[PDB]
């Protein structure tokens, strides 16, 4: 009530920002692994601004797209800076979100009462993948054309509806101008849905507070957000800016394939077709099966397991510090996931078939094993008691 | 192990380094070599004439050189396609009328565009140089179909274009012995400039802002420690043993 | 300094480009016309009275 | 030292003076680092510049 | 004029005399090829990789 | 989302009365030794499979290539 005003920061106009940014209580022992959500928010904002300024000089037609990109880089003041920021900020954004996901896996942040947050995160990941893949096409190089062909013709493996949905997706009989213009419109639209999903994700987290490197109750020792975690976020942002600008200014083409500087030519095929570096685990899992239906329907278990982790209900200790075996399994899963990433960029013959078929088995044994520790360790107090 | 093609080594280019720039005399001589040997079948079509002023020629030289050639222009009041000499805002002329003619004149092989030829393959600079200077005698046991030549730096072992860089194929205006290697070096320097005309501005901005942002990182770390000093040295008594 | 750099660069990206500026100086031929009447001619992007 | 205290008393009893000080420091440091990097760039690689080609004016 | 590059390539024989003699053994072994589809391309690549690596750091000093 | 009655006592000191930087580089070698001794197993388990698979693939490829020769 307070029958006369005290502060501008507690008035109705600034109540929301104050309560959810300035005075919000957080645990006091959060480490540097809790900054990547804000860092990814800044990455998304950078992508949106840079894209809104690139889309003032790009023409979506098969005759003009390549030459309009080169016009941007050669004839507009600073346009090379815009293109390099966009094409490398996509990679930075994926890097940051991968680190975020593995943080969530380590300290077991999916468990109760925070499974709505995990499910919304998985949905956000799907939107991210779709947006990046749709937007790798508009330059209209060789890899754009052939990657679109392979991935979007992988949808005719489905039973009877297959050819119909592929032809409806392509807007015709092959990947041509209609697909280009379609994908441009989808690319301009999806990131705003990404923004909305991010805000919903944050509200869902703020309705219970965050976890901590201990995984215990944390309502007795909390500090506000400003100025104690604002300065830590600041340190993170400046280090990230140094890294990003090392990429932009002194090595802007290391993270791409050289073949996209050759205009699309539907008759000759490249000898080694791959997508970007952040789709290679899925790509390896997908080619690991000698069957179209099995290969396509093996991605579905990946997302089903990622979306069904939170609902096992016997484990009682969250943080992996007090869980040696689950910690070792975490590191071994990380190694196996890197191995899938490396395999996804190789030719398909010996000795890569076996090494492409076993790591999927390990990647699924991870999501199968974890409830077994849940049960076998629920009864641990009764054996080790003193 | 013949389908991939030989590997081109790494050479110490004068434009490599974090604080290195283009050698503009090499750009001049490379442009001369291109316009007198290579423009017979290849084309640039991305580089205009005005790009050269301030980079390898003064303005008047480029103006006269562009006024050498003839290009077409849109309809008059009559409705005809006439021709008039070139200007500063024209692009490097093409030797054929389309790709079909290009394949017809070379035996079904299309000679590509050289604007981005360094960025487009793997390890551009060294690949182009060793490709030019790499025609050699085929190894024992292999043969090449007539109308083709051998080069280990090509994936397949057999290439279509014939060797051009030969001692005395051009005559410079500075008095440099036009050896095959000198000509190849100048050509590669010219092509690298053509592909990446923004390199020097890029490197200047990069150096400046990396330095400045490192200073800001130092300041932010101090700020952080100063704020957290109060909690991180706090002492509390709690009244519990185990 | 960072804020100024980014603002100025984004603002300057939208100004007239080198390709457009190259096409800004030339003249064409003009001819006689009937007493007191008008027929325009063609130039860069702008007519002539 | 005492110079820090003197600077503190000179500049920070108000705030608009602080804003002006920050702007001035920015638009001086920018120029200083520009000069330094340009000079080092010139020093590193002598003879390669555009005004160093010996035949720049012999195509008349 | 005379090419510097070929001069250095013919200079670097002592560096991979071993690869040279290996290729010589290959060509003497294949001597008498009947059906074709026999060749010494691997030793060829080894030899010319040796020579190129020898010439790489030395060549550009001589040029202008 | 609530709080608990606590009963504790705390003392603090002002920010401007204590040395800030010298804490980073105080006794680095013992901290490095502690970190290594604590996380050697995690490092081993992370970096083992990569090395094993890389060596195996290299060996297989070189053997196959050298067996295809004439
Ligand atoms: C009028 C009321 C003003 C007010 O309420 O003041 C509030 C508050 C100060 O309140 P106060 O209590 O009066 O001041 C007390 C302190 O002395 C105030 O001191 P302080 O500690 O709060 O000030 C610190 C601040 C000082 O700066 C300022 O605040 C003024 C500017 O430092 C920064 O703002 C750093 C700039 C952030 C840029 C980082 C960009 C990250 C990477 C960029 C892309 C990388 C690619 C290359 O101001 C701030 O704290 C500034 C917050 C800025 C955060 C905004 C986030 C921006 C991120 C968007 C970038 C996305 C990329 C776009 C492309
Ligand atoms: C790729 C194709 C995908 C197609 C769909 C595939 C779905 C596979 C999912 C398999 C996982 C099983 C899901 C089961 C959900 C319900 C299970 C459950 O335990 O709910 C019960 C629980 C509360 O009940 P409880 O108190 O435990 O029981 C009382 C007994 N006396 O309920 C709760 O605890 C509440 C938890 C709510 C948080 C989950 C809400 C749903 C997930 C949100 C994501 C959806 C957001 C999408 C946004 C865009 C929409 C298009
Ligand atoms: C994936 C979403 C489904 C899109 C789809 O399947 O479209 C196929 C078809 C609509 O297009 P279609 O009928 O094939 O037009 C050709 C006319 N000869 O599908 C239809 O005819 C009706 C689609 C209704 C189901 C849409 C589900 C979203
Ligand atoms: C969640 C994890 C997601 C990671 C996604 C990407 C994983 C790594 C992808 C990758 O391609 O890295 C391997 C990299 C590529 O090697 P490359 O030469 O391009 O392929 C042969 C073509 N000549 O080759 C490299 O060694 C670069 C190092 C990349 C990081 C290490 C990769 C771990 C496996 C390497 C040893 C096996
Ligand atoms: C003083 C102020 C200016 C300082 C500028 C410093 C610039 C650093 C050098 C820039 C550069 O060109 O790096 C080249 C490097 C080549 O890439 P790469 O072969 O993959 O090297 C990684 C080996 N593990 O490219 C990179 O590796 C970029 C990645 C840098 C961060 C790696 C840690
Ligand atoms: C195979 C399973 C081996 C472990 C079986 C039970 C052994 C229990 C155990 O304590 O193992 C200890 C060891 C590392 O745990 P620790 O002793 O805490 O070493 C810390 C050194 N800084 O080992 C572990 O805790 C992790 C064991 C790796 C699990 C591999 C599963 C495949
Ligand atoms: C692209 C994908 C790249 C993935 C990078 C891996 C990210 C993994 C995040 C794991 C979260 C984490 O910080 O693990 C911390 C872990 C132990 O830390 P903790 O026990 O919680 O704190 C004790 C304080 N003395 O730290 C360790 O156990 C140390 C293990 C280091 C081994 C590598 C050498
Ligand atoms: C006889 C006309 C002609 C001349 C003149 C010519 N080329 Fe070629 N060039 C060709 C043809 C034909 C091809 C296509 C080769 C093929 O597809 O097998 C080609 C291809 C190339 C390639 C592509 C090689 C690859 O790996 O794809 C490069 C690089 C190249 N030329 C460089 C040059 C340079 C540098 C010059 C100037 C010294 C030059 N060319 C002059 C006919 C020519
Ligand atoms: C645009 C993408 C994303 C954004 C902007 C984002 C942002 C955030 C932010 C700001 C937080 C709280 C601050 C913090 O804890 O660091 C958070 C928490 C969390 N996020 Fe995300 N995130 C994204 C993607 C993802 C994905 C893909 C996943 C999982 C697959 C995920 C899982 C989680 C989890 C589990 C938490 C809980 C935090 C805790 O345990 O304390 N996030 N996210
Ligand atoms: C409003 C939002 C956005 C707009 C208007 C936009 C616009 C564009 C445009 C016009 C291009 C083609 C120009 C070029 O390729 O050089 C492009 C390319 C691209 N976009 Fe976006 N973009 C947006 C957001 C995003 C986001 C959020 C991502 C990733 C998460 C993304 C990823 C990419 C990628 C990877 C490319 C490929 C460029 C290349 O590899 O050369 N974009 N974008």
């Amino acid at each position: 009530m307070r029958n006369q005003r005290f502060s501008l920061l507690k008035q109705p106009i600034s109540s929301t920002l104050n309560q959810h940014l300035i005075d919000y209580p957080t645990p006091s022992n959060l480490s540097y692994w809790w900054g990547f959500g804000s860092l990814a928010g800044i990455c998304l904002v950078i992508q949106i601004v840079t894209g809104v300024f690139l889309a003032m000089h790009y023409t979506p037609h098969v005759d003009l797209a390549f030459n309009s990109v080169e016009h941007v880089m050669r004839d507009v003041e600073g346009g090379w800076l815009l293109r390099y920021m966009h094409a490398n900020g996509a990679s930075m954004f994926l890097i940051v979100v991968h680190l975020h996901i593995f943080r969530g896996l380590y300290h077991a942040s999916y468990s109760s009462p925070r499974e709505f947050v995990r499910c919304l995160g998985v949905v956000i990941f799907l939107l991210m993948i779709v947006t990046a893949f749709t937007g790798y096409v508009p330059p209209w190089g060789q890899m754009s054309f052939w990657g679109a062909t392979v991935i979007t013709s992988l949808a005719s493996a489905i039973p009877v509806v297959g050819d119909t949905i592929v032809t409806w997706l392509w807007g015709g009989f092959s990947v041509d101008n209609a697909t280009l213009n379609r994908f441009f419109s989808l690319h301009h639209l999806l990131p705003f849905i990404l923004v909305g999903a991010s805000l919903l994700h944050l509200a869902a987290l703020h309705q219970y507070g965050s976890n901590n490197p201990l995984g215990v109750h944390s309502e007795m020792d909390q500090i506000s957000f400003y100025p104690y975690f604002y300065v830590k976020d600041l340190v993170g942002w400046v280090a990230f800016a140094i890294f990003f600008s090392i990429w932009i200014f002194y090595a802007p083409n290391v993270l791409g394939h050289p073949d996209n500087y050759i205009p699309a030519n539907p008759m000759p095929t490249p000898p080694h077709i791959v997508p970007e570096w952040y789709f290679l685990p899925i790509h390896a899992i997908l080619r690991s099966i000698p069957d179209k239906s099995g290969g396509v329907a093996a991605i579905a278990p990946v997302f089903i397991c990622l979306l069904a982790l939170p609902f096992f209900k016997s484990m009682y200790v969250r943080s992996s510090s007090f869980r040696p075996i689950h910690q070792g399994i975490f590191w071994l899963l990380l190694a196996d996931r890197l191995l899938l990433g490396w395999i996804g960029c190789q030719p398909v013959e010996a000795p890569f078939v076996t090494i492409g078929q076993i790591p999927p088995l390990v990647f699924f044994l991870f999501f199968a094993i974890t409830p077994i520790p849940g049960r076998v360790g629920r009864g641990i107090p009764n054996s080790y008691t003193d | 192990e013949a389908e991939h093609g030989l590997a081109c080594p790494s050479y110490p280019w004068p434009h490599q380094g974090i604080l290195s720039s283009y050698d503009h005399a090499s750009i001049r001589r490379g442009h001369q070599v291109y316009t007198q040997v290579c423009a017979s079948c290849h084309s640039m079509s991305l580089i205009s004439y005005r790009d050269l002023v301030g980079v390898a020629y003064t303005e008047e030289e480029v103006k006269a050189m562009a006024a050498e050639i003839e290009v077409v222009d849109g309809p008059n009041d009559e409705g005809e396609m006439f021709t008039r000499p070139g200007k500063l805002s024209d692009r490097f002329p093409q030797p054929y009328a389309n790709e079909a003619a290009a394949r017809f004149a070379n035996g079904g092989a299309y000679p590509p565009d050289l604007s981005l030829i360094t960025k487009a393959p793997h390890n551009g600079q060294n690949y182009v140089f060793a490709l030019l200077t790499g025609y050699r005698d085929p190894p024992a046991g292999v043969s090449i179909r007539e109308g083709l030549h051998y080069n280990p730096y090509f994936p397949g072992g057999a290439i279509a274009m014939p060797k051009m860089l030969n001692d005395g194929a051009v005559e410079y205006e500075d008095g440099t012995p036009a050896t095959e290697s000198q000509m190849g070096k100048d050509v590669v320097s010219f092509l690298s400039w053509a592909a990446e005309p923004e390199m020097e501005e890029r490197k200047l901005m990069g150096f400046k802002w990396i330095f400045v942002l490192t200073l800001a990182l130092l300041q932010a770390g101090y700020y952080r420690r100063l704020r957290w000093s109060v909690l991180k040295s706090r002492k509390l008594v709690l009244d519990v043993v185990n | 300094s960072l804020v100024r750099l980014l603002i100025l660069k984004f603002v300057l990206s939208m100004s007239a480009s080198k390709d457009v500026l190259a096409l800004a100086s030339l003249e064409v031929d003009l001819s006689s016309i009937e007493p007191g009447t008008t027929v325009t001619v063609k130039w860069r992007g702008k007519p002539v009275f | 030292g005492g110079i820090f205290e003197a600077l503190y008393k000179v500049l920070m009893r108000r705030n608009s003076v602080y804003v002006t000080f920050v702007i001035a420091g920015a638009f001086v440091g920018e120029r200083a680092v520009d000069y330094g990097v340009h000079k080092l760039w010139e020093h590193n690689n002598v003879g390669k510049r555009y005004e160093d080609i010996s035949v720049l004016g012999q195509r008349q | 004029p005379v090419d510097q590059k070929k001069y250095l390539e013919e200079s670097c024989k002592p560096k991979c005399v071993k690869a040279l003699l290996e290729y010589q053994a290959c060509v003497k072994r294949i001597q008498g090829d009947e059906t074709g589809n026999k060749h010494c391309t691997g030793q060829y690549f080894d030899y010319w990789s040796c020579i190129d690596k020898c010439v790489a750091q030395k060549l550009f000093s001589k040029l202008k | 989302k609530g709080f608990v009655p606590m009963k504790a006592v705390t003392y603090g000191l002002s920010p401007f009365q204590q040395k800030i930087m010298p804490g980073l580089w105080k006794d680095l070698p013992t901290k490095i030794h502690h970190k290594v001794s604590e996380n050697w197993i995690s490092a081993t388990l992370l970096l083992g499979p990569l090395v094993g698979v890389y060596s195996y693939v290299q060996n297989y490829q070189e053997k196959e290539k050298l067996s295809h020769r004439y």
Side-chain angles (χ1 to χ4, degrees), chain B residues 47 93 102 118 171 200 203 236:
Chain B
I47 294 92
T118 55
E171 201 261 333
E200 306 175 8
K203 293 194 167 169
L236 73 164

Side-chain angles (χ1 to χ4, degrees), chain B residues 120-140:
Chain B
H122 185 247
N123 209 5
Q125 315 287 325
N126 318 302
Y127 179 72
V128 160
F129 191 69
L131 174 76
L132 290 188
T133 69
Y135 287 166
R136 213 161 295 142
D137 300 290

Side-chain angles (χ1 to χ4, degrees), chain B residues 1-2 5-6 9-13 29 129 133 136-137 139-141 150 152-153 167 176 179-182 185, chain E residues 1-6 9 23 27 30 33 38-42 44-45 48-49 52-53 56 59-60 63-64:
Chain B
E1 55 277 17
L6 195 51
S10 292
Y11 292 115
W13 292 95
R29 301 179 298 185
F129 191 69
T133 69
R136 213 161 295 142
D137 300 290
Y150 178 83
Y153 301 87
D167 307 79
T176 304
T179 300
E180 61 91 27
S181 291
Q182 164 77 75
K185 181 179 184 293
Chain E
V2 185
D3 187 16
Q4 318 87 327
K5 175 154 177 183
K6 290 298 184 185
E9 313 185 338
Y23 183 104
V27 54
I30 190 176
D33 199 0
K38 295 186 178 180
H39 45 79
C40 287
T41 183
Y44 196 68
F45 278 25
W48 284 120
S49 296
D52 291 331
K53 293 298 182 290
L59 183 63
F60 265 47
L63 277 297
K64 190 173 187 294

Side-chain angles (χ1 to χ4, degrees), chain A residues 74-75 228 232 245 250 258, chain B residues 18 50 120 194 203 210 224 228:
Chain A
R74 278 170 187 256
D75 275 21
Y228 294 108
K232 184 177 282 191
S245 84
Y250 274 95
Chain B
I18 78 166
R50 47 163 179 76
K203 293 194 167 169
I210 303 280
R224 201 255 167 183
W228 273 76

Side-chain angles (χ1 to χ4, degrees), chain B:
Chain B
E1 55 277 17
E3 293 83 3
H4 282 291
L6 195 51
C8 64
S10 292
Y11 292 115
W13 292 95
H15 45 275
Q16 276 177 0
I18 78 166
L19 274 163
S20 310
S21 81
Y22 285 133
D23 183 18
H24 286 279
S26 192
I27 305 315
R28 223 177 185 274
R29 301 179 298 185
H31 176 252
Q32 201 189 341
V33 180
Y34 158 88
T35 187
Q36 295 199 11
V37 174
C38 183
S40 172
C41 85
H42 295 278
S43 74
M44 305 298 222
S45 77
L46 284 181
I47 294 92
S48 179
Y49 269 119
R50 47 163 179 76
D51 286 339
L52 296 172
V53 310
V55 184
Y57 297 80
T58 191
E59 171 160 340
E60 307 306 321
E61 313 185 315
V62 170
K63 203 176 79 69
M65 182 179 72
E68 284 187 358
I69 74 181
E70 303 285 326
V71 309
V72 310
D73 189 358
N76 51 1
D77 65 274
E78 182 65 26
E80 298 294 334
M81 293 321 90
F82 55 91
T83 65
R84 81 292 183 276
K87 309 190 296 172
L88 272 175
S89 75
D90 281 325
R91 304 165 91 89
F92 282 173
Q94 292 180 354
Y96 303 121
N98 43 53
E99 65 182 1
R103 296 214 193 93
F104 179 52
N106 278 114
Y110 177 68
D113 191 302
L114 290 185
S115 303
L116 300 160
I117 185 54
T118 55
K119 286 202 295 181
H122 185 247
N123 209 5
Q125 315 287 325
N126 318 302
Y127 179 72
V128 160
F129 191 69
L131 174 76
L132 290 188
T133 69
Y135 287 166
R136 213 161 295 142
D137 300 290
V142 73
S143 297
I144 58 172
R145 55 191 175 183
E146 176 52 41
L148 282 71
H149 315 76
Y150 178 83
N151 203 358
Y153 301 87
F154 198 59
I159 201 167
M161 65 179 288
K163 184 178 184 293
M164 245 134 279
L165 298 192
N166 265 334
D167 307 79
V170 72
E171 201 261 333
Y172 295 114
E173 58 192 346
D174 69 344
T176 304
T179 300
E180 61 91 27
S181 291
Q182 164 77 75
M183 293 177 71
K185 181 179 184 293
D186 301 314
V187 174
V188 170
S189 286
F190 170 60
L191 282 185
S192 301
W193 170 81
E196 287 170 352
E198 84 268 7
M199 182 278 288
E200 306 175 8
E201 172 184 356
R202 205 171 83 208
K203 293 194 167 169
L204 281 169
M205 293 180 183
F207 195 82
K208 171 156 85 76
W209 283 112
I210 303 280
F211 180 72
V212 165
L213 277 169
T214 299
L215 292 197
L217 177 64
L218 203 64
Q219 182 269 1
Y222 176 87
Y223 187 20
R224 201 255 167 183
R225 302 267 286 173
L226 168 72
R227 279 319 179 237
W228 273 76
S229 58
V230 171
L231 304 162
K232 262 174 172 272
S233 87
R234 171 192 65 180
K235 182 221 184 174
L236 73 164
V237 305
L238 258 186
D239 189 359
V240 62
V241 173
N242 56 69

